[PDB]
Amino acid sequence: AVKIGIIGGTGLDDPEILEGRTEKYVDTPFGKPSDALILGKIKNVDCVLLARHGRQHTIMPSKVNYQANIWALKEEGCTHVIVTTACGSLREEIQPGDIVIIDQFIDRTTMRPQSFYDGSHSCARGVCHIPMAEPFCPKTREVLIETAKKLGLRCHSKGTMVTIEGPRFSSRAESFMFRTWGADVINMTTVPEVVLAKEAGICYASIAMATDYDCWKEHEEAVSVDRVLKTLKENANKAKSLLLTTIPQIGSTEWSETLHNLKNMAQFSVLLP
Amino acid sequence: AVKIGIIGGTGLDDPEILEGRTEKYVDTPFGKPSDALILGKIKNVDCVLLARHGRQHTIMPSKVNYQANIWALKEEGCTHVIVTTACGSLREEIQPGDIVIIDQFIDRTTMRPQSFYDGSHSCARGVCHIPMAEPFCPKTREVLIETAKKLGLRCHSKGTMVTIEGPRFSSRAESFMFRTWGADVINMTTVPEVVLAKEAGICYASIAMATDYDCWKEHEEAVSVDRVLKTLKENANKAKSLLLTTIPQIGSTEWSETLHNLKNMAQFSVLLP
Amino acid sequence: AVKIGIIGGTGLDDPEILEGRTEKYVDTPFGKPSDALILGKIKNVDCVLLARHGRQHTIMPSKVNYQANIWALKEEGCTHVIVTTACGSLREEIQPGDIVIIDQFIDRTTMRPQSFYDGSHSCARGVCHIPMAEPFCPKTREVLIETAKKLGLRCHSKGTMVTIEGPRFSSRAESFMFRTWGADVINMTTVPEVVLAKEAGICYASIAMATDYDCWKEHEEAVSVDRVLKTLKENANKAKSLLLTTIPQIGSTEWSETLHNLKNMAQFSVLLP
Ligand SMILES: Nc1ncnc2c(CN3C[C@H](CSc4ccc(Cl)cc4)[C@@H](O)C3)c[nH]c12
Ligand SMILES: Nc1ncnc2c(CN3C[C@H](CSc4ccc(Cl)cc4)[C@@H](O)C3)c[nH]c12
Ligand SMILES: Nc1ncnc2c(CN3C[C@H](CSc4ccc(Cl)cc4)[C@@H](O)C3)c[nH]c12
């Protein structure tokens, strides 16, 4: 059995995706998740939805409790986490509305706990050094890429996400520098969400949707809250269809080996006294 | 009516610039500002001076309460904030003693709140994502650039400031890397001062004065506290004259549109529940 | 008289290096050091050993009390600090098992106090801006380099260490970017250990041992805890021999000038009210 946690991002966190919905507030050792978990199904597949920023978008990226969110989904029995994330495009060919199935990140966050193993929690004892060479589940990403193609969606098969602390958007000097580093898209939430998922032995994949060109390009609409909201109003249906079509595919394929390998990588990264 | 807050930096924070001086200690929801506000005038113009590091230079860059400083100046009724900042030069042609009217930044700070909207304050409710494509007021910068020319001062019409956490100065590897990124000057205070000013709807501009060549160049005096202090002893009069000459120019030009546009950009960056 | 603090890193923190061992737990104004200081001698030389991560490796890099560690060694009367550090290699020619006598760093840490002078401690009053152009003692490094040659060890005479926050290892995008920056090796502990040593007026040098190629190369064993542990099991004897041979050399050379210059650089970096 698979069970899929879905973490909804900005404008991309609609509960109406699940049938047979039940709201469940939970607690974890790291505190409360962003909001109630929503338990439901897509076709025959058990899913668990969680709004990254709360259902009213009340929590800014720096204050999102990534530890509690991931812990809650794990405790619920999730084998996979597929998230949505809005993002700025750092590449001419990645147009607003395009989906990017990201495969790498560059961390520019500064204020966030990136591990469960902080020496303060009984549930996560020891020192943990998780490998990050392959941060995203390649098997899940494959299915997302193939599905987006079946849907006729404009979609990119890879991309490096730079995650900034926020909540401010980047300056132009920063935007230009991220391009020189080889970042393709920019957001405020991928790190440490992807890190904690890996420590939890969970298959994690991200659906990034471009909403703007940040501030590097010429003759584009400037990034702003209104601009991001506008692009998502117009294009959010794409991410919904992709999830709805991808999820039944995940449920019909075999994961025992992939998950065994993840659980091992996670277990062997922890040193006990 | 305009009112100009002036935040004095290292060696560049002299109260004697204002006539008709009155000392006023204030409180804000984010805590106490660095020091007493000093209320005064330059020609007919209402100004408010604040020493970034305290009048005895007792507060290091990491511990400066940028939120309280900006909030205090806003509450006082400031329409503009013009600051001074000492800095290292990352460019051969920017010589110690030169003024740089910076137009961009690269953030390398790690420990600083960069927003009023942290979900803990009643006075600043919601989630705020301020755009940072144009961090400094171009109209104020124009007047500074034209004025420095009228004064015959060595001055650069643009520049990218990298702001490091400090309080240590950079290593040589870091100094060299900042050059590859396209940083022109280096300090410890521009971020998040410039960010918070933007969230407050205030026209912010910075007078940067080069005091050293950091540690990248050859055959220059090494950066140290003594070296920075020495260059400022010799050149601080320039920043004083530039302020004294610029400020009456700001007071005689029309700002209603510029300020309306800033207030809008600020208001539309905030999402309420 | 010299006295040498030795901070042992991962797999490189063996007390058996000292003769005449006495265990001494201490307190400092910044809290407790990682573990008991171990007082002892190498030939005629007074040494003080401290396990960076605790003797059971229980403390992850982010939580190591670098302030307490350096303060404790200073209070004990150490003139020099020579440390060991495991690291990933960012350079083809730096092979697992090679020693790198690092001479520069690039800071990518985010959560660590980098100064004793935080305005909260009576023992360290004022604002301190330590110069970091030459972070490591060149005289100590010379002796390490010459000694490693006498031992026939594969050793590199310089290198730039990028220190990441951890505890996760880097992504591939990050690993590749650190190469473009000119980093040669990667770890999680050099900063701010090297910074605090400089503020304390102590000669600091680092013995870095490559344990892996991080994740940038092709056809190498992936970095993981097991992989790092394996390389250290095989090569730790090298770092031990190098320390044991270097230390008597330090004790027989003259340091009064070097140490006077360090003490001055440290004293003149502090501004009092
Ligand atoms: N240029 C850019 N830079 C960094 N991040 C983003 C993002 C990603 N997030 C969107 C969001 C800011 S826009 C927005 C819109 C509607 C509402 Cl209800 C709430 C917020 C932040 O979490 C970052 C999109 N474009 C970006
Ligand atoms: N190479 C460089 N790197 C980073 N920042 C600076 C700065 C800017 N600030 C000066 C100041 C250090 S020097 C100084 C001198 C007198 C007194 Cl009373 C107090 C401090 C820090 O706030 C950074 C100048 N050169 C710099
Ligand atoms: N590729 C790499 N990246 C960053 N740091 C390292 C380091 C340096 N440290 C090793 C250590 C992780 S591996 C390990 C092995 C045995 C035990 Cl008991 C405990 C931990 C961290 O402190 C970073 C080696 N390779 C690295």
The residue of chain B with its CA nearest to that of A181 is: B181
Instruction: Determine which helix (DSSP H) or strand (DSSP E) holds C169, and give its type and residue range.
Output: none
Q: Number of structural domains, chain C?
A: 1
Residue B177, annotated ligand binder?
no
Q: How far is the CA of A90 from the centre of ligand 3 (A)?
A: 33
List C-alpha distances in Å: B143 to A216, B111, B246: 26, 33, 7
Of B107, B118, B268, Cβ closest to residue A225: B268
Residues C4 and C250: beta-carbon distance below 8 Å: yes
The Cα C35–Cα C16 span in angstroms is 16
Residue type, C40: G
Asked if A214 is an active-site residue, the reply is: yes
Residues 6+ apart with CB under 8 A from B47: B3, B4, B5, B6, B18, B39, B40, B41, B247
List C-alpha distances in Å: A143 to A49, A86, A116, A147, B60: 20, 20, 29, 6, 52
Q: What angle do CA B101, B102, B107 make, to 5 degrees?
A: 160
How do strand C99-100 and strand C155-156 relate by DSSP bridges?
Answer: parallel
* Burial classification of residue A33, based on how many CB atoms lie within 10 Å of its CB (0-12 exposed, 13-18 middle, 19 or more buried): buried
3-class DSSP string for chain A: CCEEEEEEECCECCHHHCEEEEEECCCECCECCCCCEEEEEECCEEEEEEECCCCCCCCCHHHCCHHHHHHHHHHCCCCEEEEEEEEEECCCCCCCCCEECCCEEEEECCCCCCCCCCCCCCCCCCEECCCECCCCCHHHHHHHHHHHHHCCCCEECCCEEEEECCCCCCEHHHHHHHHHCCCCEEECCHHHHHHHHHHCCCEEEEEEEEEECCCCCCCCCCCCHHHHHHHHHHHHHHHHHHHHHHHHHHHCCCCHHHHHHHHHHHHHCEECC
Helix residue ranges, H only, chain B: 66-75, 138-150, 172-180, 190-199, 225-251, 256-268
Q: How far is the CA of B228 from the centre of ligand 2 (A)?
A: 6
The Cα C215–Cα C186 span in angstroms is 11
* Burial classification of residue A20, based on how many CB atoms lie within 10 Å of its CB (0-12 exposed, 13-18 middle, 19 or more buried): exposed
> Given an 8 Å threshold on Cβ–Cβ distance, is B180 in contact with C183?
no
At B272, list the tokens: 């309420």
State if residue A213 touches ligand 1 by the CB under 6 angstroms criterion. no
Q: Which of C73, C196, C69 is nearest to C135 (CA)?
A: C196
Residues C247 and C4: beta-carbon distance below 8 Å: yes
The Cα C70–Cα C145 span in angstroms is 24
At C242, list the tokens: 């190098």
The Cα B106–Cα C157 span in angstroms is 32
Residue B243 belongs to a domain with what CATH number? 3.40.50.1580
At A21, list the tokens: 């919905």
State if residue B188 touches ligand 2 by the CB under 6 angstroms criterion. yes
Q: What angle do CA A128, A130, A135 make, to 5 degrees?
A: 155
How do strand C127-128 and strand A127-128 relate by DSSP bridges?
Answer: unpaired
Q: Which of B27, B24, B31, B30 is nearest to B50 (CA)?
A: B24
Chain C residues close to B180, C-beta within 8 Å? 181
Ligand 2 atom closest to the CA of B86, numbered from 1:
8
The Cα A54–Cα A36 span in angstroms is 8
State if residue A61 touches ligand 1 by the CB under 6 angstroms criterion. yes
In chain A, which residues are followed by a C-to-N distance beyond 2.5 Å, i.e. a gap? none
Q: How far is the CA of C186 from the centre of ligand 3 (A)?
A: 9
Query: Packing angle between helix C190-199 and helix C66-75, nearest 10 degrees?
Result: 40
Residues A162 and A247: beta-carbon distance below 8 Å: no
> Given an 8 Å threshold on Cβ–Cβ distance, is B167 in contact with C117?
yes
Given phi > 0 = left and psi -120 to 50 = alpha, else beta, which region is C54?
A: left
* Count of beta carbons in the 10 Å neighbourhood of residue C142: 15
At C260, list the tokens: 């006077």
Q: Is C238 helix (H, G, I), strand (E, B) or coil?
A: helix
Residues 6+ apart with CB under 8 A from C41: C18, C19, C20, C47
Resolution, given in Å to one decimal, reads 1.9
The CA-based dihedral angle spanning residues B150, B155, B157, B160, taken in that order and rounded to the nearest 10 degrees: -150
Residue C173, annotated ligand binder?
no
3-class DSSP string for B53-88: CCCCCCCCHHHCCHHHHHHHHHHCCCCEEEEEEEEE
Cα-trace Rg, chain B: 18
Nearest ligand atom owner, CA of A128: 3
The residue of chain C with its CA nearest to that of B225 is: C269
Chain A residues close to B136, C-beta within 8 Å? none
State if residue C212 touches ligand 3 by the CB under 6 angstroms criterion. yes
- Structure-solving method: X-ray
Given phi > 0 = left and psi -120 to 50 = alpha, else beta, which region is B236?
A: alpha
Q: Which of A12, A249, A261, A1 is nearest to A142 (CA)?
A: A249
Chain C interface residues (partner A, CB cutoff 8 A)? 53, 56-60, 62-63, 110-111, 165-177, 180, 215, 222-226
Q: Which domain holds residue C152?
A: 1-273
Residue C146 dihedral angles phi and psi, to the nearest 5°: -65, -40
Residues 6+ apart with CB under 8 A from C72: C26, C28, C33, C37, C50
Q: Which of C55, C87, C109 to mutate to test the pocket of ligand 3 (most atoms within 8 A of CB)?
A: C87
Residues B4 and B74: beta-carbon distance below 8 Å: no
> Given an 8 Å threshold on Cβ–Cβ distance, is A224 in contact with B131?
yes
* Count of beta carbons in the 10 Å neighbourhood of residue A267: 10
DSSP state of C76: T
Residue A10, annotated ligand binder?
yes
Residues B142 and B253: beta-carbon distance below 8 Å: no
